[PDB]
Symmetry: C3
Subunit: 662 residues, 3 copies
């Protein structure tokens, strides 16, 4: 049909063909001929994964040992495996092989917080520094199977640290630099890391950040950490190093040579742990294999973004999150292109920094979160005209829904109606892109991620019946019908939590946690999470974890945290608190509690003080009532006589109306 009765996003939406200038700027024949070749390749990646991914794994990756089986396992049994029998090394495929080919080609284009401190590392430079850091870790006893934590800002040392760890066959666990001491402690202890790599202080927005200080605070309770490597980011001599545990990056790396043999690992040996928040309260360490994850990175980076050897990628992300892992580090370095590592903010020294960077290095591909696009539209639209952005041809959006208006703003003001826009939908647990418009191939509907990617058999499940929905113009739970190379393989030392979360809810499928809709053309429209996980400015948060931090305050008895829409951050956290026995004073105190328990980025937008929370006959909190109230749907609550304290609802409603502003 032409009209949609379910997918209202799609009604009267004109397709947006790739502009002709995209192809004029393309350095070579595109990797895909047209949308028909894409459909053929897609159908093969579903019907015949062995014949499709086998050759691609050989083309894009360098192997130390061949694989005998392309694909094994099933979602329902949680035993997925790819490229069995094969051996390889991640740092070899990202550094060594490119350095041998051309050691002088740029690899890390590092733009520091303050541009005066920017620099460029070639592949030859990167090989030597990765080798030396790996040499230090090796002399410390790090070996295949160990885990090493990283607590660094978004700069060269973070990338070097990750690649040095993977060079030895160990798994890195990168901890976002905005995390508090308690969040560091939790992640390090769950992984039992033997070593940590960090720095003395950080630079953000021109202001100094206390990085080593928070490590010392967490490490008092991290008995498994034997040694710490400290990079002199500020060289502030007043930063204390603990004798026998802490050692300086520059001093130790000077003892070792600029080449170290990489350690061969199995395709399914763990490459890294990345701790993610879910519906649990405690963060869960998502584990990724080596071969499957790397192939997914190279494959998506190449085909969805249309990356060629001549190109330059600026992923405005942070390696503390999956987007930096896959599309600032592994994706581009696997393909041998330069990648821009930006340490600062889009506002420093002014709101043209992104564009100053793009113009400076003639970047061809730009990848950013819609939260930033909203900021630059609100505060820095006047800066764009100062910069030449004609080197760009691919503009990616990631991590949250992109509104059609922001899509248009991105298309016109950054791309000049001349670039292809790739709204990429995916997750930490998927490793790489799931649904995205391939650059130069897929026509765009603003606000739609369009078609599923190679190896991704997407489906919609009816939330009522648990049955897959045939046909288009449909809505439901977004699930995937078979595993794919870059799919996460477990939750570290807690594979049962992994099964209960992703595989068991919809047996036979993978459960994304998201709902979506499919229009008459097969285009998917993401409709946000269905498991009440909150995404604030691109950061996955656990409302359960925020409730725990608020309760830790001994003046608080009960806490209930929900998420609502926000014009700036996408979603905002609303915290409801009941006290046992101050005003904004207490509310400010609680916000700071969340800041130092989890991290500044998890602070609630607002704190509502209530006499008590609505609870069932059981004694448990009905959070549905707090969600309906917080979204000004006070009506639609329904019959509340099932509660044990229905009189509380009135107080909840009035408190939200009185305290959300103030």
């Amino acid at each position: 049909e032409q009209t949609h009765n379910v997918v209202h996003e799609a009604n009267g939406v004109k397709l947006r063909e790739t502009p002709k200038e995209f192809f004029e700027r393309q350095p070579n024949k595109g990797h895909i001929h047209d949308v028909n070749q894409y459909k053929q390749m897609y159908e093969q990646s579903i019907k015949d994964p062995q014949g499709f991914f086998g050759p691609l794994a050989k083309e894009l990756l360098s192997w130390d040992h061949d694989f005998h089986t392309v694909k094994s396992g099933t979602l329902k049994n949680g035993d997925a495996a790819w490229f069995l029998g094969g051996e390889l090394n991640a740092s070899y495929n990202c550094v060594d092989r490119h350095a041998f080919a051309n050691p002088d080609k740029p690899a890390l284009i590092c733009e520091a917080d303050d541009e005066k401190d920017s620099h460029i590392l070639t592949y030859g430079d990167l090989l030597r520094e990765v080798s030396k850091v790996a040499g230090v870790l090796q002399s410390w006893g790090i070996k295949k199977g160990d885990t090493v934590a990283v607590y660094l800002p978004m700069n060269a040392q973070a990338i070097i640290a990750m690649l040095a760890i993977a060079r030895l066959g160990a798994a890195h666990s990168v901890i976002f630099a905005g995390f508090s001491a308690g969040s560091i402690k939790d992640r390090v202890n769950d992984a039992s890391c033997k070593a940590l790599i960090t720095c003395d202080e950080g630079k953000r927005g021109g202001r100094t950040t206390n990085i080593k200080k928070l490590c010392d605070e967490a490490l008092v309770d991290c008995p498994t950490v034997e040694k710490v490597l400290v990079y002199k980011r500020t060289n502030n001599p007043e930063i204390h190093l603990t004798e026998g545990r802490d050692y300086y990056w520059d001093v130790e790396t000077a003892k070792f040579p600029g080449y170290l043999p990489p350690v061969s690992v199995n395709s399914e040996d763990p490459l890294f742990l990345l701790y993610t928040s879910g519906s649990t309260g405690t963060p869960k360490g998502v584990v990724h294999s080596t071969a499957g994850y790397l192939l997914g990175a190279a494959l998506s980076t190449k085909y969805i973004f249309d990356i060629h050897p001549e190109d330059i990628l600026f992923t405005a992300g942070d390696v503390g999150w999956i987007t930096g892992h896959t599309y600032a580090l592994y994706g581009p370095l696997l393909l041998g292109v330069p990648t821009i590592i930006f340490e600062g903010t889009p506002a420093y020294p002014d709101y043209g920094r992104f564009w100053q960077i793009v113009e400076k290095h003639k970047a061809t591909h730009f990848y950013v979160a819609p939260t930033a696009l909203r900021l630059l539209r609100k505060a820095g639209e006047q800066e764009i005209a100062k910069y030449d952005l004609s080197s760009l041809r691919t503009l990616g959006s990631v991590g949250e829904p992109i509104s059609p208006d922001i899509w248009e703003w991105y298309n016109e003001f950054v791309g000049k109606n001349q670039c292809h826009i790739s709204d990429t939908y995916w997750q930490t647990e998927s490793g790489s892109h799931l649904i995205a418009p391939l650059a130069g191939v897929v026509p765009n509907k603003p606000g739609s991620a369009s078609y599923p990617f190679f190896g991704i058999d997407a489906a919609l499940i009816d939330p009522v019946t648990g049955v897959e929905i045939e046909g288009n113009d449909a809505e439901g739970v977004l699930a995937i019908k078979d595993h794919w190379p870059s799919m996460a393989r477990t939750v570290y030392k807690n594979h049962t939590k992994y099964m209960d979360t992703y595989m068991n809810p919809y047996p036979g499928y993978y459960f994304t946690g998201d709902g979506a809709a499919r229009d008459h053309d097969g285009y998917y429209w993401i409709r946000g999470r269905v498991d009440d996980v909150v995404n604030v400015s691109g950061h996955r948060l656990s409302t359960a974890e925020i409730e725990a931090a608020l309760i830790e305050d001994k003046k608080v008895s009960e806490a209930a945290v929900v998420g609502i829409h926000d014009d700036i951050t996408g979603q905002a956290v609303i915290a409801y608190v009941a006290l046992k026995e101050d005003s904004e004073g207490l509310r400010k105190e609680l916000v700071l509690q969340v800041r130092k328990t989890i991290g500044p980025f998890a602070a609630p937008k607002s704190v509502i003080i209530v006499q008590d929370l609505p609870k069932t006959r059981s004694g448990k909190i009905m959070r549905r009532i707090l969600r309906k109230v917080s979204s000004n749907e006070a009506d639609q609550l329904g019959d509340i006589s099932t509660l044990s304290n229905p009189q509380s609802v009135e107080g909840i409603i009035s408190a939200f109306g009185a305290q959300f502003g103030k």
Copy 2:
């Protein structure tokens, strides 16, 4: 036609394989007739490189190629096969079949009480082996470690052995009937880092105290860092030691159903198997050579095809369960029946109920069991449909012509082939046996030597090989073979003193045998400076009025525990001048 030495063979008609064997055979037999067998055998002796090289590639999956098929000599105790090659045992027993057909049955587990019986597919087996391997790996188990197993004959024993071999470590299986002291000795000699066991066992309906005996042993086993305990009975009164003991179900739940197998060298030890007035010695088997011997013997002697189902009524506590309940059949990708209980529980028809239930085609048992069932449950055999069987194996002890006939008629219905298999823990796999559907049987004779086994009879007095037939003597083997044991753990000298030095240039089985005019071997049971002495005879001469040890000059020395000179002369004039003890 007449024998003056091998009296067993006089007037024994050959017993051709019944026609029903071939009617029940799922495919064309692997060997056409005895003449083809003789050609293949002669090559496996004269040209081991050209014979075993191709078979090693056919029957095994390799992670790294081998550059030399065969190396070393018996006289130097440096035997090695497929040098340079790398592989993994659990990959060849599980992974490769799971990829091919994950739903094909692998372990048909018959519990002590049938209500608890279940079937694991190759896909199921891969997941369970991977999860246990993940637990052990997170505990620090790695190549070169030894891990003890103290479990009954059930799925967990099989899973545990394969998970240990998946990491490149060596499993040391300890028969679940052993005492605390027997556990203690074996664990300490092997210096095991971990132990896998269960809380209690079920045998004949009665509960056995398994974990309790382990705790008693482990008080003096400092090398054991952690123990994995399976809830076989879930008896809550069974104590676990904080910080050491962890539950199988709890820990395996933390890890995924796939774990990369760890490649090992062809000559890396696959397992240690301790023997029962001697002190227990850990017989060590290589990885590649042992596996090939298992697959090769299982395939050709038993005539195993992919469609078949093997019931080895043995226990992994002994070599028979190791090779023909686990490795042999799983290497070939067939189902294997793991029976936890006794032949009497819940009644004396259980074996036959099991064979009927799963339509087993191959049955392998010790004459001791056949004597029991003949004495107490003969009437139960006919109650069950046993027409799926075509091969009936006997192992571990001589099968008398009388028992052979009873086995042939009441179990086989004069329609099956009987394979009297002779071998030892140290040989890894069959040495002398009638190939099913190929070799005619003489009841009580193991018949011909197997591929790669150059059998001979040695005069025990002179150490000289006996030429010709109608002969008797010490059973010895003239060259090493792929599945031959490689050492005794951390005691290679005892290995040399036992197998290689008594008759230098040969392997000494410890058994006597006779060879008749047709070449059939008849096992006849167990038997200083080149002169053989009898410790028993020196004790007798001294009593009318002794032990052996290694010696760097005279090879071995005899120590017997004015009068000392009188006794030495007594032994010289009773036995012989060269038979005097070194010291009295």
Copy 3:
């Protein structure tokens, strides 16, 4: 024609290889003439990938292919060869020759007193090396560990090194003449998990205190968990520490005559060898596995002209690089017998070397000019008592050889019928740098002549730091690019390595020596600067 700078070169007639060399040669020479050598040399400089790749395949057995022949630069101290490949040193030096012909001799052992001499075949060598590795494997020694050796020059020293390399560990040989303080400094720097030594030694008929010195040093060596002690004299009053010291014979009896060798990466360290430098305490020179082995095999073959039928007698000691490269690896890699001499040139008389050469029909002899000066002074008359007609290559090493000693070496030992190879190299080069190839390069007494494959020699002006073009020149000797057997670091002190070798003249390797180059390109070593 005339030299104004290289005064050593004026009026020095070339000395061609005697005819009897080519008569005693068992097979067609590996290089026909000097002109073919220069075509090969120029390829080894202009095309290292195309020259050394095939030679790496030809001379070494691999467990994994390599993907890149050469990587890195002198200026960044990140040189690497045969990247991605794996192999094992003991497999190439023992196993593969045992399989081919186990009865061929490998170690021709001449003890301090000849009555105790014996010969190990490659089959015998493999069984012994396996048993010792089996001992170390059971002790926890594994790839990445370092194991110290404190043994005289005899079979056990050779066996211990090969057994340590069989497991993928690095052996740190400590010359048996070192004091306890020297042992202490070396063992601690390397953090050795185990030590292999003996109870006592035999040197010139006298007993030496070996275990006693180890015990005095080990009181300050916490990392050493276990010690393996060989019974050289079997003196029962030698104390072994309970729980730490075990006997060689007692432990090897427990293990089988074969053990699988452990694969190591091309650039995994094969050994540490501690040198005395101009800067304080000893420094652990580290050598790769593939690069070093290729260099040892390639130079042994082409400079000495070694063939399968030949027998090499390197009268050195494995405490030093000369014994590492040319008493052990070089010859064993090529599957020829090597003569391991424990005693002195003086005991029981000054005809010991020659009695050995005659005894075993040695075709190659390799010694330091210090021994030549000793024998010239004291043992010249003994040379005529022994048949030395099997020799055809006479090597000099470790120090300049004066034209006088050269002539003496040439006439009384070589009988004016042998070729003389004055080899110049260092511990840090792994193998020969400059030497006259046997049967190829005519000699100028006192000159090492031309650089070897992959060695791009040059002279630098010490004052200006600029390479000196043209011949008839003097200055600091340097190399313009790294070579396969070049040392890769100083253990846990890569900065000392960069400061010593790579930084003085960036872009070059600094040999620490001064030299001169004459109009014919022959190099004249002028000693340390």
